[PDB]
Structures are given as structure tokens and as C-alpha cells.
Design a protein around this ligand. Structure first.
Ligand SMILES: Cc1cc2nc3c(=O)[nH]c(=O)nc-3n(C[C@H](O)[C@H](O)[C@H](O)COP(=O)(O)O)c2cc1C
Ligand code: SF4
Ligand code: SF4
Ligand code: SF4
Ligand code: SF4
Ligand code: SF4
Ligand code: FES
Ligand code: FES
Ligand SMILES: [K+]
Lengths: 112, 453, 218, 183, 111, 72
């Protein structure tokens, strides 16, 4: 836990001093009634304020310089995500998932 | 067997109030009302009366579910006075020929159910019956038989007439309430039940005309006499609407458990063309499946004897089919009926009835394959038991009845149809040359049977 | 007021009067649904949520059947698997083959639930064809392709109860029943566009967003 | 029947055409409402629509809006009721609505012949209207008069136990101006 | 190549199936409502230096809009010429339509 | 499946000190051991007459960042 495992991972120093990762649980999509994607905790990185995306003039391609733009880690528990982020010495913040309040729902309430 | 419940079934005694009293309709009305619902419920239970609307449910048992009404809260009673079902001609005659008999039954039944009002739901096609029934109701109001003082008794009771505008689905009890409340008239899901939450959010009971009209006699001639007719637990008399391939169709008031063969031969002449010319019989109504000739030879009119043979005694609507008839087209007509009469809220019957109608159209001409007989049978299974109301079940039995006992006759059409076309037909009615060009399917016989229009 | 019921051998406890589909979610059991939404009134017009009550000869719709104490609910028996395939086949009987040109493609509940619970093959070869429904015009925000509707009444329930706009309803009877406003008019509501999210199929879609993207790209 | 769930504005049927119950129907409508509890007055839509239909001739869009305003209800709620029931004619229709039952009990006793004879006499296919706006042929489901299976309906009147030669006489009576004996 | 209907209308409805299947992610598609309201693409790029010539886009196409011609003799002096846009792919479809019809008439039954 | 269950149980019985658990999937048997037990279990599975696994066909790893020990 306290071990600074980033000294041996080989990742560049910019992951620690310049990038911010978000630990979050995916919110339920408003267009679908499934909840499978909300059962896992994920880690992604905030975009670079400049150079995240720019248009290549030759073909209109989406050019980028962020090498972490397409990396999304998967975790089964919130504690596991925190332990891994702490182990790598990342600057992170946790977005607590919104919980749906339970309200009783019955067919009789359509008239009463 | 004379001295039945109904005596004016032939329009020979008048449709007035006085003749009804001379017929015994309004007799001892004060005493019966003051006997309390405890005795009325027990008599109905002890008379073995069962629901005449099609379900066949104990009338006495379904009246006790109504909660007591000590504070005179507005409970309701609804009379299912619309027919809807093809081949049924019972409710029309009771409303027309004996309008005052039903009105007397509503008050006596209402007293048992603790009902403060009665709503009669009659078809829009029965305008003459509704006008005649309204005339009887208004006379009973002036005579004091209806209102806040029912023949001196303190039981206040009102009667109203609500007219539908044409819907077979409105015959169902929950859909009937929706029509009265001013909605489309789609059946409700069973919980909460109409006994607890019904018309206007009040306790309610929905009963057939043939069930309410028998109540006055049961309260007078005792439940023992009514229970004497029929076999065990099928106790009572029944009005039978007989029509089709018969000599002289009519409506008779025989008793339960009477053999089908004797009933069609004792009166109504006989089968048109003799007994050897009988192809099939559809009792109860269009909902129940058909029965073949040999089965009908020993069929007793009961909610159980007809249940055993694979059929149902819904409304005693007996439809006779001689051998010189199109049996598949007759069943196809039933499928087209339920497609048009489907209210269309649940997925199964909104789609299944259309699915059955499309497949039955190719069967009547033979533009299908023999394996598709099992396909349409499977599609009917996907409808039963997956619907809010029973119209989905009622739309699958006629097709299954055709398959069960008349499958070889359906195969004959397919074999005959291939002779004319030469090459065999593929699934769905497609040939080896049929293709779509410029907005239409060409080079293929299309079954144009969707009522054209 | 809690009642201890059973869903596929799992103990559940919820408030009295809760629907079975609510107790199943609390127990971790997933039941397919089209017409049920946890913010709208209870409807039972889609029949996709059918479950088998332990001691009862009838299949109950879990979104409308109230919970009882001691009730044992089975949701994965072969009888229910038959019901899910049968209801799926009815839904896709008249549905147009529009997935490539339909904006709900990658986020369609009809696609995913037909894949998960329906059969892999269809049996509709009828030469008469499917039902065809004209497209209603209800303004510049909501794009209508009414061939794709499965008659689930999510839009009707939302616009009448939540949004408070009673100009949207169901007109017709049977297979000819059509969702819309009957007359030629628009939907006047500041929350009308939420009908696009609630519509599980491509019948109601965003008009500005039409054709411009697929959900897996975003 | 002819089931259309969409209204299209026409000079004959459009919301601009004013409609209002006559002073005779204004009073009779009030009795209808009195047959329902005051807090459930919305249950009187069905009788009010038929009251307007008989007065005007058919269930126009002006009648549906008039009933909606009369009962303090959204117009769409009245639209749902009018389009769900087949006896609400959402088109001008003729003087006499010819309703021929084609169900199995009526089909056995030769209801097909009844339809054939009428089609070649009035020269209008089912669902059409005679040029003089006098007749209207309509295919209808069971009407309950199945014991007398060869049965037809004209407006509000039934006609049972018919033959192809008898149906022409009934049409001839209405064409001439004489009411045939119903039975 | 991008193919047309016999009336000249483009077959592709910008359904973006080929872009999703493409193992090398060699296809870039941008789409919107056409001027007349049709669902059409206005940008269809294929990186021939990135494609692995695997046929997944042809298999996934619901309208047979994107196909692979039997052509192989199109080596180019510069790598820029191997960046096909919609104009290049549509021109290829017009140029090679007859040869594509040969292959389709013999291979479609096996698909 | 049944034969591998019996053989997998025989290894745990022979090495209760090292074999944490075993699993069987169709025709594949997996033995789960601690890092301090790898040498002993591999030596047993190589030299025992009933289990002569002389060939080590593959050595690989998989990353599971969720767990305290990332790699299997
Ligand atoms: C689709 C459908 C149509 C029905 N039509 C009628 C009808 O026309 N007359 C009737 O008495 N019951 C009809 N029923 C049955 C009623 O729902 C109910 O069983 C009956 O009205 C109760 O009255 P009872 O106690 O006399 O049986 C119908 C049921 C269904 C599903
Ligand atoms: S089964 Fe058919 S008729 Fe009955 S409620 Fe459902 S959709 Fe309506
Ligand atoms: S709504 Fe779903 S199933 Fe229907 S066409 Fe669109 S993506 Fe396909
Ligand atoms: S349009 Fe969409 S939301 Fe409305 S009933 Fe149809 S499927 Fe449901
Ligand atoms: S053939 Fe080329 S462009 Fe097509 S899917 Fe395969 S790699 Fe992508
Ligand atoms: S798969 Fe075919 S139709 Fe779909 S986007 Fe690609 S080329 Fe267009
Ligand atoms: S989700 Fe329960 S019937 Fe639709
Ligand atoms: S079947 Fe024609 S009136 Fe009943
Ligand atoms: K949608």
C-alpha cells in the first residue's frame, strides 16, 4: 500500500505530476433499462486541456497526443480501484455513484 | 317440462308491467327485500346457480365477496346486458320480451350485494331493446318499485342504462367498467379486483342478464327446485340459442345436462340433411373449439361434461354445421372476428390474432404447406395464458379445434391447391417466381382477403 | 410492513404492495421488460415480464402483481423461457427491418432483449406483409417512425402524468391502433423531448440528432 | 370495418365548422349527466357523442371538440373514445346505414348471397356511398340476431330472416320512400 | 469501391456497420440528413495503408454498398494516393461496377 | 470431469501443506498454490510416478489490478 510502485512500473513521470484520473461507477444510460454496466468500477483520465483532439487537415482525422485517451481500467470493487490508484501514486478523485431511491409501485395506485 | 323461468319467450303475453305482475314478476317484493342478504346469499348458494356470462362461476360465491355496507356507501351492480358473442341470442329476448323480469332481478340481487345503484350495459345495436327496457324502468320508478322507497322498504336502489357503441371486448367485466367511466374500454389487470376497486373506485359486481333474471324465481320457488335440474353441481335451467344448419332455428328453455343429440332432435326439427350430414357443432359460442360428429352423439349440456370433451358451455350458443359447408372458412371467420374485436393493448392478442388471421386466409385457399399446420398451432399456444383478458384465449381455441379434429380436411385443401398451381407453395404463400417489383409482389397469387375496402 | 418472499431461491424483503419486478431487482434477478418504467404508472400491455407464481396455474405480470408474504417466485423455468420467446416473436412480427437506417440501433432495448431472451430465428414469411403506419408530425424536436412502435404507452403515460400534456394518446382499436395526437398538431411541453429517451425503440427519436452518430462511437 | 386512426381536415369535416347542441338537445344532455356521479361526469362522453351524431348526422371533429369543452376534458380523451367504437361514424355517411353481418352463424344461412344481391343493385361496393347520399353499405360483425341468421340492419332498425329477393324489396322501399316492415 | 443502385442512388445509408467491424479501424464515416432528407454520408474514408483487406466491411454491409473489387494493380507513387475518400470510392464503384456484378452473381448464393 | 476431480483431490491429499485449492473445467485441471509452494508442487508433479509431467509447455501471466496481488 505505502510502497511507491511507480518507481518500477516504467510509466512516464507525467502520469503523476500532470494527469488526473477519475475513479467512478458508470451511470445508467437514459435510453436503456439495463444496469449491467453499472456493476463495475472504472478508472479513466481527464482530457488534456490542449491537444486532446485536433483535426488533421489532410483527411479530417481526429489527431491526438494523449496516450491515455483510450485507456479505461475495470475494477470489481471500489476498494480495489483506490488501492491500485494509491499504489501507482496517481492523482485521482472519486465520483460517488448516484443511488436510486426506492418507491413502492403497484397497479392499484393507478386509481388510488 | 312446462312452467320454466321465462314464459314470454315467444311474444304472446305482452311486454307491459301489469302482465308481468299477472305473470308473477313483482310478487312479495317487500318481504324478499326485508329478508336480509344473509338469506339471499344462502339461497343462491343452495340453488347451485352458476354464471351464465360464459365463465361458469358460482353466482352465490361471487356475491359474498362484496363488503358489507352499513353506512350506505355507494356500491354498484352492473348487468352485462350486451351479447357480442356470435351465435348468442339470449340476452336480447330477455330485455325485449320480458323487460320487467330483469328489473325485478336487479333490485333483489342488489339487496344481496348491498348495491345502491344498478347500471345496465346494452349494445348500441339493441336500440329498440334499450328503449323498451327504459320504458319498463321508468314505469317501475313511477310505480315505486325503484327509488329510495322500494315497496315500503328502506333499501334505496336506482337503475340506469348505459349504451355501448359496438365492442365485443366491452362484454368483459373490467372493460365494461372502463366504458361506463368514460374511457376507451380496455380490460384492467385483475388485481385489484372489481369487488374491492371497481366502478368509480367502488365495490362492484358484473353479472349476465340470464343470471340476474333467474334470481327472483330462486328467491320464491326455493333453491331446492332450481337445484333439482341437471347433474351434480350443474344445477339449474338454461336458455339455448340454436342456429345454423338446422331445420327451424329457435330459442328454447330446456334444463342443464340435456343430451346434445336429443336437444337438436326433440325440437328445432333436426339436422338439415339428416344426422349423417352433420359435420360439426360449436356449443357455447365462437370462443370454444368445435366438436366432431361422433363426440356430439353423447354430449350433455354442462359446464363439466362439455369441459371433459374438450369444449366449453359459454353462452349455450349452439352452431350446427352440416357436411355441405366450408368448415375452414367458418373457422377463418372466427379468427377474423377476434382480430377485428381485439382491443389491442396486450402484445399477444394484438399481434397473434393478426398472425392467426393471415395464416387462416392461406388455409382457406390452400396456399400453404402441411408443416405450417403445426406452426399455426404453436402460435396459438403463445397467445393463451399471456394476456390481460380472456379474448386472447378465445381467439386460439377455434383454430385449435379445427386442427384437433379436422386436420385431414385442412391437408386436402393444400393437396388440391398444388394441382391448380402445379408447383408446390413455399412458406408464407410464396412461389418459385414470386418477387417484389415497383411496390408490389408480382408473379405470385396473393391472398387478397383482408376485407378489401 | 416488510414481506419475506422468494425469487429463484433468494430471500427478499420490500414494502407491502411492491411489485414483483421491484422485488426481483432488489434480489439481483433480472426480468425483461418493455412497458415498465420505474417513474411511470403501472401498465401490463407488453407481457414481457411474465413470471410463474409457485402455487398458481396462471402466469402473472411481475410489474403489476403485488407482493405477498411467503410468495415464491420463479423467473427462469422453461415455461417462462417459452413465454419470453413467444412474446418476442409477436413484437417482431410486424416490426420493420429498419435497424441499419434507425437511430436506436446500438442502444435498442428491443434488439438487446430479443437477442437475450428471444429466439435466434424468425418464422414470419407471410406474403401479405407487415403493418404499415404513416408518420405523425408533432413538431421539429421529435422525429416519428411509427412502424417501429411496439405499443408500450411509455410516451402516453409520461406526457399525461409527468409532463402534464394531454394532447398525446392512443387512437384506434386492435392492430389499427396508432400512437399520436389523432389531429395534425404538435406536442406542447417543455419536457416533451424526454419521450425520446423513454421510447425503447426508434419510433420516437431526436430530429436534430437524426442519422449523425451511433452510440458506440460516442 | 373501415378503421382509420388519423383525422385529415376536409371542408365537410374540420374544426372550424361551428357545432352546438340545439335547445332540445341542450336539455336532454343535462339528464344524461345526472345519470353519473358529479365527480365522475367524464363517463357521459359516450351518450353525448351519439347525441351529437344523431343531431348532425355523423361524429365530426367539431362534435368531439364540443363534447370535450362541454365536459371539461382534453380533446384527445374524446378522440380516444370516438375512434375506439365502430358505431361512431367519422365521415358524413348516408341516410340509411346498411349493416350486413358476415359472421359464421349468419354466413351458414347464406349471408353471402345477401351481400351479392345488394352490391349489384345499389352499384356500390361495401364501404361506399350512393351518389345521392341516400345509402351506405357496411360490412359488420355479429349483431346478436343469429337465430334468424339472414339478418340485416338499416340505421337503427333490424331486418331478420331475409332472402336475396327480399333484400331488394327493402332497398326499393327506402329508395321509393316507404318504410318496410321490420321483423 | 462504393456501389450504386441501378437508378444511380448510392446504396450506403451511412449505417456505420463497416466502421464498427473493421479490425484495423481503417474506415472513417461522418453522416447527417441529406438536403432532401435521405440518410446519407458526406464523408467516407478508407486508409488503404491501414486496411488488412479482410472483407469484414463487405460482409457487414446490409445493402452491399461497400465491396472489394478483384483489382490489385493500383500501386501508387505517394502514400497520400492510398487515402481514399468518398469521391475515390464512388468513382471506383462506377469504374468497376461490371466486374463486381460478375463476382456477386456467382458468390451471392453462398452468402 | 470425474477422473480429474479424483486426481486433483489426490494431489491435495498428498500435499495439504501447499495446495490451496483445485478446480476442474471439462478436461482441464487447475492447481492453486502460493508462491512459496510453487517449487514443491512442480517438483512433485514432475517426479511422482502417477504424475510424470516432464514437459512445461507454457509459462504465462495475467493482470488483475483489482486484487491485492495483480498477477496470476
Ligand atoms: C372478450 C370477452 C367478451 C365477453 N362478453 C360477455 C357478454 O357479452 N355477456 C356476458 O354476460 N359476459 C361476457 N364475458 C364474460 C364476463 O367478463 C363475465 O364473465 C360475466 O359478465 C360475469 O357475469 P356472470 O356472473 O353471469 O358469469 C366476456 C369475456 C370476455 C373476455
Ligand atoms: S387480450 Fe387483447 S382484447 Fe384482451 S385486454 Fe389484451 S389486447 Fe385487449
Ligand atoms: S427500434 Fe430497434 S429493432 Fe426496431 S429497427 Fe430500430 S434498432 Fe432495429
Ligand atoms: S412510441 Fe415508443 S414510448 Fe410510445 S408506446 Fe410506442 S414504443 Fe412506447
Ligand atoms: S477489408 Fe479492410 S476496410 Fe474492410 S473491415 Fe477488413 S480491414 Fe477494415
Ligand atoms: S456497412 Fe454498408 S450501409 Fe453500413 S455504413 Fe458501411 S457501407 Fe454504408
Ligand atoms: S413489463 Fe410487465 S407487462 Fe410490460
Ligand atoms: S352471427 Fe350474425 S347477428 Fe350474430
Ligand atoms: K427512442
Amino acid at each position: 500500500t505505502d510502497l511507491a510502485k511507480e518507481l518500477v512500473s516504467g510509466a512516464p513521470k507525467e502520469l503523476i505530476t500532470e494527469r488526473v484520473a477519475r475513479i467512478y461507477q458508470e451511470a445508467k444510460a437514459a435510453t436503456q433499462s439495463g444496469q449491467h454496466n453499472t456493476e463495475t468500477w472504472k478508472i479513466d483520465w481527464d482530457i488534456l486541456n490542449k491537444g486532446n483532439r485536433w483535426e488533421n487537415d489532410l483527411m479530417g482525422y481526429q489527431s491526438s497526443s494523449d496516450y491515455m485517451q483510450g485507456t479505461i481500467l475495470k475494477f470489481d470493487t471500489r476498494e480495489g480501484a483506490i488501492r491500485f490508484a494509491k499504489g501507482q501514486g496517481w492523482d485521482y478523485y472519486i465520483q460517488e455513484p448516484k443511488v436510486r431511491r426506492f418507491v413502492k409501485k403497484d397497479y392499484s395506485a393507478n386509481f388510488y | 317440462d312446462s312452467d320454466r323461468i321465462f314464459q314470454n319467450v315467444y311474444s304472446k303475453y305482452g311486454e307491459d308491467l301489469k302482465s308481468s305482475q299477472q305473470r308473477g314478476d313483482w310478487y312479495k317484493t317487500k318481504e324478499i327485500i326485508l329478508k336480509g342478504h344473509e338469506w339471499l346469499i344462502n339461497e343462491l348458494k343452495a340453488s347451485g346457480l352458476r354464471g351464465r356470462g360464459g365463465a361458469g362461476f358460482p353466482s352465490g360465491l361471487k356475491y359474498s365477496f362484496m363488503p358489507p355496507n352499513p353506512n350506505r356507501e355507494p356500491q354498484y351492480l352492473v348487468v352485462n346486458a350486451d351479447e357480442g358473442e356470435p351465435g348468442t341470442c339470449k340476452d336480447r329476448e330477455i330485455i325485449r320480451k320480458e323487460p320487467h323480469k330483469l328489473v325485478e332481478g336487479c333490485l333483489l340481487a342488489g339487496r344481496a350485494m348491498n348495491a345502491t345503484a344498478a347500471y345496465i350495459y346494452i349494445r348500441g345495436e339493441f336500440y329498440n331493446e334499450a328503449v323498451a327496457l327504459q320504458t319498463a324502468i321508468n314505469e317501475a320508478y313511477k310505480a315505486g318499485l325503484l327509488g329510495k322507497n322500494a315497496c315500503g322498504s328502506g333499501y334505496d336502489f336506482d337503475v340506469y342504462i348505459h349504451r355501448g357503441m359496438g365492442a365485443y371486448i366491452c362484454g368483459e367485466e373490467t372493460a365494461l367498467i372502463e366504458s361506463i367511466e368514460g374511457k376507451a374500454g380496455k380490460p384492467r389487470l385483475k388485481p385489484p379486483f372489481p369487488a374491492g376497486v371497481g366502478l368509480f373506485g367502488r365495490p362492484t359486481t358484473v353479472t349476465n342478464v340470464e343470471t340476474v333474471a333467474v334470481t327472483p324465481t330462486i328467491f320464491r320457488r326455493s333453491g331446492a327446485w332450481f337445484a333439482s335440474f341437471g347433474r351434480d353441481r350443474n344445477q339449474g335451467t338454461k336458455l339455448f340459442c340454436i342456429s345454423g344448419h338446422v331445420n327451424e332455428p329457435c330459442t328454447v328453455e330446456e334444463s342443464m345436462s340435456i343430451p346434445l343429440k336429443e336437444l337438436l332432435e326433440k325440437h328445432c326439427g333436426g339436422i338439415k340433411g339428416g344426422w349423417d350430414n352433420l359435420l360439426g357443432v360449436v356449443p357455447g359460442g365462437s370462443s370454444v373449439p368445435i366438436m366432431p360428429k361422433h363426440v356430439c352423439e353423447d354430449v350433455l349440456m354442462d359446464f363439466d361434461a362439455l369441459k371433459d370433451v374438450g369444449s366449453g358451455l359459454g353462452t349455450a350458443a349452439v352452431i350446427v354445421l352440416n357436411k355441405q359447408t366450408d368448415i375452414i372458412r367458418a373457422i377463418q371467420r372466427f379468427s377474423a372476428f377476434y382480430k377485428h374485436e381485439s382491443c389491442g393493448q396486450c402484445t399477444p392478442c394484438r399481434e397473434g390474432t393478426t398472425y392467426l388471421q393471415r395464416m387462416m386466409d392461406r388455409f382457406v385457399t390452400g396456399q400453404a404447406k402441411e408443416k405450417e399446420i403445426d406452426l399455426i398451432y404453436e402460435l396459438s399456444k403463445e397467445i393463451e395464458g399471456h394476456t390481460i383478458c380472456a379474448l386472447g384465449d378465445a381467439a386460439a381455441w377455434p383454430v385449435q379445434g379445427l386442427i384437433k379434429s379436422f386436420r385431414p380436411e385442412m391437408v386436402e385443401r393444400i393437396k388440391q391447391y398444388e394441382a391448380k398451381l402445379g408447383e408446390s407453395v413455399s412458406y408464407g404463400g410464396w412461389t418459385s417466381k414470386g418477387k417484389v417489383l415497383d411496390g408490389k409482389v408480382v408473379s405470385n397469387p396473393i391472398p387478397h382477403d383482408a376485407h378489401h375496402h | 410492513k416488510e414481506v419475506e418472499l422468494t425469487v429463484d431461491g433468494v430471500k427478499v424483503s420490500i414494502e407491502a404492495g411492491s411489485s414483483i419486478i421491484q422485488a426481483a431487482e432488489k434480489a439481483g434477478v433480472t426480468i425483461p421488460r418493455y412497458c415498465y418504467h420505474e417513474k411511470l404508472a403501472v401498465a401490463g400491455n407488453c407481457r414481457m415480464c411474465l413470471v410463474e407464481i409457485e402455487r398458481s396455474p396462471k402466469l402473472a405480470a411481475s410489474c403489476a402483481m403485488p407482493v405477498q408474504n411467503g410468495m415464491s417466485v420463479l423467473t427462469n423455468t422453461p415455461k417462462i423461457k417459452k413465454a419470453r420467446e413467444g412474446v418476442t416473436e409477436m413484437l417482431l412480427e410486424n416490426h420493420p427491418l429498419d435497424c441499419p437506417v434507425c437511430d436506436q440501433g446500438g442502444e435498442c432495448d428491443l434488439q438487446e432483449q430479443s437477442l437475450r431472451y428471444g429466439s435466434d430465428r424468425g418464422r414470419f414469411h407471410e406474403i401479405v406483409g407487415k403493418r404499415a403506419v404513416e408518420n405523425k408530425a408533432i413538431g421539429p424536436l421529435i422525429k416519428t417512425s411509427m412502424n417501429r412502435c411496439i405499443h408500450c404507452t411509455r410516451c402516453v403515460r409520461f406526457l399525461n402524468d409527468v409532463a402534464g400534456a394531454p394532447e398525446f394518446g392512443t387512437a384506434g382499436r386492435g392492430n389499427d391502433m396508432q400512437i399520436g395526437t389523432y389531429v395534425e398538431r404538435n406536442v406542447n411541453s417543455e419536457l416533451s423531448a424526454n419521450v425520446i429517451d423513454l421510447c425503447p425503440v426508434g419510433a420516437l427519436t431526436s430530429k436534430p440528432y437524426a442519422f449523425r452518430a451511433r452510440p458506440w462511437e460516442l | 370495418s373501415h378503421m382509420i386512426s388519423v383525422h385529415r381536415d376536409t371542408p365537410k369535416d374540420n374544426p372550424e365548422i361551428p357545432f352546438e347542441f340545439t335547445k332540445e338537445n341542450l336539455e336532454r344532455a343535462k339528464e344524461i349527466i345526472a345519470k353519473y356521479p358529479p365527480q365522475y361526469k367524464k363517463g357521459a362522453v359516450m351518450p353525448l357523442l351519439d347525441l351529437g351524431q344523431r343531431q348532425l348526422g355523423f361524429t365530426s371533429i367539431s362534435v368531439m371538440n364540443y363534447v370535450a369543452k362541454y365536459l371539461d376534458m382534453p380533446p384527445m380523451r374524446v378522440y380516444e373514445v370516438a375512434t375506439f367504437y365502430t358505431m361512431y361514424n367519422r365521415k358524413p355517411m348516408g341516410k340509411y346505414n346498411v349493416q350486413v353481418c358476415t359472421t359464421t352463424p349468419c354466413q351458414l344461412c347464406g349471408s353471402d348471397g345477401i351481400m351479392k344481391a345488394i352490391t349489384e343493385h345499389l352499384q356500390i361496393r361495401p364501404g361506399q356511398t350512393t351518389p345521392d347520399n341516400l345509402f351506405t353499405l357496411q360490412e359488420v360483425e355479429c349483431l346478436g340476431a343469429c337465430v334468424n341468421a339472414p339478418m340485416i340492419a338499416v340505421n337503427d332498425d333490424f331486418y331478420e330472416d331475409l332472402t336475396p329477393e327480399r333484400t331488394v324489396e327493402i332497398l326499393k322501399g327506402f329508395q321509393s320512400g316507404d318504410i318496410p316492415k321490420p321483423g | 469501391a462504393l456501389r450504386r443502385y441501378p437508378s444511380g442512388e448510392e446504396r450506403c445509408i451511412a449505417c456505420k456497420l463497416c466502421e464498427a467491424v473493421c479490425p484495423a479501424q481503417a474506415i472513417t464515416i461522418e453522416a447527417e440528413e441529406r438536403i432532401d432528407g435521405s440518410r446519407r454520408t458526406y464523408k467516407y474514408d478508407i486508409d488503404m495503408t491501414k486496411c488488412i483487406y479482410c472483407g469484414y466491411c463487405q460482409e457487414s454491409c446490409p445493402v452491399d454498398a461497400i465491396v472489394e473489387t478483384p483489382n490489385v494493380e493500383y500501386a501508387t507513387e505517394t502514400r497520400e494516393e492510398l487515402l481514399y475518400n468518398k469521391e475515390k470510392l464512388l468513382a471506383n464503384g462506377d469504374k468497376w461496377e461490371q466486374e463486381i456484378q460478375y463476382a456477386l452473381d456467382a458468390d451471392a448464393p453462398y452468402r | 470431469i470425474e477422473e480429474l476431480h479424483k486426481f486433483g483431490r489426490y494431489i491435495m491429499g498428498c500435499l495439504p501443506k501447499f495446495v490451496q485449492q483445485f478446480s476442474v473445467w471439462k478436461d482441464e485441471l487447475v492447481i492453486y498454490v502460493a508462491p512459496s509452494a510453487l517449487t514443491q508442487v512442480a517438483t512433485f508433479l514432475k517426479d511422482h510416478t502417477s504424475a510424470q509431467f516432464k514437459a512445461c509447455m507454457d509459462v504465462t501471466a495475467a493482470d488483475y489490478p483489482t486484487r491485492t496481488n495483480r498477477f496470476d
